[PDB]
Amino acid sequence: DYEETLRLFKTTVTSPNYPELCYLVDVLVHGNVDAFLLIRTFVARCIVNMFHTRQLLVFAHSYALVTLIAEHLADGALPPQLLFHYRNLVAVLRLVT
Amino acid sequence: MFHTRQLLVFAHSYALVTLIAEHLADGALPPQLLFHYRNLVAVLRLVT
């Protein structure tokens, strides 16, 4: 069962309220690992503050961002539910492959 | 209006409904009301 996480992802993607910086940070991170490691606090505050103020989660659009969130941000600095959502997405990819 | 009266407000006409979930969405509101109006515009998109 992943229908709830996929439903939330659908709400995020088909929403014009997607925050501008999410693209900009996707470009500057460039999918580079330690580059994402250096920006950990900013993305952690951004995802919790966004999810609390608006239900749609952020940085779901780019695969590199999703994978780097799921691995390196998992160490902490995030309430477990959002990390669990991202891990469920990555597990959905693993099930598909 | 929503909190006291239990009815949402400015739903009676298209211009207000379409402007609320494009320009007012940036903050300033609880998620539930904004998503009610976004659901109304999404219903319009589905039906068209």
B46 inside 8 A of chain A by CB: no
User: Would you state the torsion angle of the CA atoms of residues A6, A12, A15, A18, taken in this order, to the nearest 10 degrees?
Assistant: -160
Rg for chain A (alpha carbons), in Å?
13
Q: Could you give the 3-state DSSP secondary structure of residue B10?
A: coil
Instruction: Tell me if A69 sits within 8 A of A79, measured CB to CB.
Output: no
d(CA B44, CA B17): 11
B34 inside 8 A of chain A by CB: yes
Query: Nearest-CA residue of chain B relative to A15?
Result: B38
The dihedral sign for the CA sequence A82, A83, A89, A91: negative
Closest CA to A39 of A13, A59, A15, A57: A59
* b/e burial code for range A57-71 (CB count within 10 A of at least 16 → b): bbbbebeebbbbbbe
Report the structure determination method: cryo-EM
A49 inside 8 A of chain B by CB: no
What does this entry list as its resolution, in Å?
Answer: 3.5
